[PDB]
Amino acid sequence: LSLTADQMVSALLDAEPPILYSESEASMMGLLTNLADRELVHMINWAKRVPGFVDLTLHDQVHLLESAWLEILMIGLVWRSMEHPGKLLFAPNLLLDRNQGKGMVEIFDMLLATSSRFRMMNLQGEEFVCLKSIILLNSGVYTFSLEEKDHIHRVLDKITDTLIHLMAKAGLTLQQQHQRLAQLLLILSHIRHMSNKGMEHLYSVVPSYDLLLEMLDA
Amino acid sequence: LTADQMVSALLDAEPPILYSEFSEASMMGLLTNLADRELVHMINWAKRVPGFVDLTLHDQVHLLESAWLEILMIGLVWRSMEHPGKLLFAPNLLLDRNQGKSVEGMVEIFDMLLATSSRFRMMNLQGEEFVCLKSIILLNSGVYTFTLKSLEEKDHIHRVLDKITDTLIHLMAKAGLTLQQQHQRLAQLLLILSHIRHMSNKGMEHLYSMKNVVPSYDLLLEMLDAHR
Ligand SMILES: CCN1CC[C@H](Oc2ccc([C@@H]3c4ccc(O)cc4CC4(CC4)N3C(=O)c3ccccc3)cc2)C1
Ligand SMILES: CCN1CC[C@H](Oc2ccc([C@@H]3c4ccc(O)cc4CC4(CC4)N3C(=O)c3ccccc3)cc2)C1
């Protein structure tokens, strides 16, 4: 909460998790499930390095991860796929196009369109890691103590300050800084929608509290 | 449009507060009837949101198909803002969460609505901010799920969303917030739109679990597609 915007960016950039590799349709879904399961462990490690996260109770950290993990998996997929129009880069050895998706193809198309939007806004890495932290802190805050929510709101305020700082350094006018901040946060409501539809697809499943708690390694 | 002209147009577009036409058995019937009547006024409101009628009728329908439940829910939260623990579906239909326990799955959504109302209250959300947020929902909700014409439409929607951002900022500056406070408040408002998107998805699931579940394409087209 005392970190400068430069130090917040550096912390987030240093916390970035690694890109993992993948290990017919049936084998395709098994591969994707296994990849997501391995990514989750790295996601927990990443979350523990987001400044402010571990000041929350363990119970609240678990709730935030429960609400956010699918959104975080999807935004990372969208980021990896930016430079690959029309395809989704699940892993460096697992690049799929829309035809391989043929309720899969509707979510596949939403993800491709998000990656398209990122590509047209020329989303930067520094902006991406702030967006990912906002998903972690924002997604479960409405659905939980009041001190905990205050702390989460103070951290979100710091990430907003950091996003604005990055845009100012890139030379954006104040008007362009506000407009870009808004454009980026409006994409998060589309990522929320995808995660909701993504969950509906998966149930047609979630990591348990105990599993998340164990990976947090109190 | 200037920011002040944008606010004025949105305030003048605001639909009226409707009334319900009581027992737990009749509750879903009253709510359905109320929402059906609200949808008609929502259509008239959307046509008055600057830039909306520049779109094709097809795209207008698609935005309303994406956004209509979010828009009903945000109005409900706004009407309930000053009534802690209650949802003011209508001035004569004010429910608490024990009344939501009647239908399976209802209390979960009721609690999400109550938490949003509580958040609006904690932020002291102003009416001018509210109408901006509702217009953002209409323009943003269906834009990621829409070809030369499509590119032109998306560019136009993003330009109108940028104008509403400038309007939100102007409202906060004219009220004397600092630049830091302006950016922080803008972010806090827009992040609430993710929760509203979440509530609308859970709500749609709830509506299908009961099962005329949504306004059809042609119904929306019919109401949007007016003659002269
Ligand atoms: C941790 C929870 N359990 C373990 C995993 C199970 O959930 C899963 C979670 C994620 C996926 C993949 C996956 C993998 C890696 C990634 O980076 C991202 C994704 C994205 C994603 C979610 C949309 N997905 C799909 O397949 C998909 C993509 C396009 C259209 C339709 C579907 C599979 C299963 C339960
Ligand atoms: C236009 C479509 N038809 C309309 C009827 C069908 O959709 C409907 C749309 C809305 C509702 C109400 C309703 C009414 C007015 C309002 O301002 C807001 C709402 C909100 C709401 C949606 C969550 N709701 C519920 O009951 C509810 C409230 C609390 C918890 C769980 C459920 C009923 C039915 C198809």
Author numbering:
A (entry chain B): 308 to 330, 338 to 416, 420 to 461, 468 to 527, 533 to 546
B (entry chain A): 310 to 330, 337 to 461, 465 to 529, 532 to 548
Question: What is the paper's account of this structure, in its own sentences?
Answer:
We solved x-ray co-crystal structures to reveal how the T6Is bound in the ERα hormone binding pocket and to understand the structural basis of differential efficacy. In these structures, the T6Is are well ordered in the ligand binding pocket and form canonical ERα LBD antagonist conformations with H12 packed in the AF-2 cleft. Hydrogen bonds are formed between the T6I core, E353, R394, and a water molecule while the side arm forms a hydrogen bond with D351 to favor an antagonistic H12 conformation that is docked into the AF2-cleft. The T6I core is superimposable between the 10 structures but the side arms adopt divergent vectors near H12 that correlate with ligand-specific antagonistic differences. Interestingly, the F425 in H8 is rotated away from the ligand pocket in the T6I structures compared to laso and RAD1901.
